Amino acid sequence: ADISRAEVATLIEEGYSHSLLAAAKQGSTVLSAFQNVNMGTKTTHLPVLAT
Amino acid sequence: ADISRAEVATLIEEGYSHSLLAAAKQGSTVLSAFQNVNMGTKTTHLPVLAT
């Protein structure tokens, strides 16, 4: 007869590590490339020179 | 049985922005390339060597 690894049960604990549990978040490209314009309503008009 | 956006009509105001209504004006090239001579009268004579 013997002592197997399965004969010792939860005297053998399993560990945990968060060393692989991170990812950098990536923002919107267009929100950093261009001016953000605040709005107060669904539709904003912008006049532009045309001739 | 509900209020759509088109059921509220002009209780919704449309907005305006001038953030797109600007342009730098471009000067004359010949007035920056060459000497600007201050004239007091319509005609100035300049003699030049010719032979």
Contact B20 A46 (CB under 8 A): yes
What are the CA-CA distances from residue B42 to residues A15, A28, B3, B39 (Å)? 96, 61, 73, 7
Resolution attained, angstroms = 2.4
B17, two tokens: 């922005």
C-alpha B43/C-alpha B51 separation (Å) is 24
How was this one solved?
cryo-EM
Between vectors from CA A11 to CA A10 and to CA A13, what angle results, nearest 5°?
Answer: 65
C-alpha B33/C-alpha B48 separation (Å) is 22
Q: How many residues does chain B have?
A: 51
Q: Say which amino acid occupies A3.
A: I
Which residues of B are less than 8 Å from A45 in CB distance?
14-17
C-alpha A38/C-alpha A44 separation (Å) is 10
Longest dimension (CA), chain A: 98
B26, two tokens: 């471009």
Q: Which of A35, A42, A46 sits opposite B21 (nearest CB)?
A: A46
Give the SS3 label for residue A30: helix
Comparing CA positions, the residue from A14, A32, A43 lying closest to residue B13 is A43
* Residue A41: alpha-carbon gap to chain centroid: 30
Q: How many residues does chain A have?
A: 51
Query: Which of B4, B5, B10, B19 is the best residue to mutate to test the A interface, defined by the most A CB atoms within 10 Å of its own CB?
Result: B19
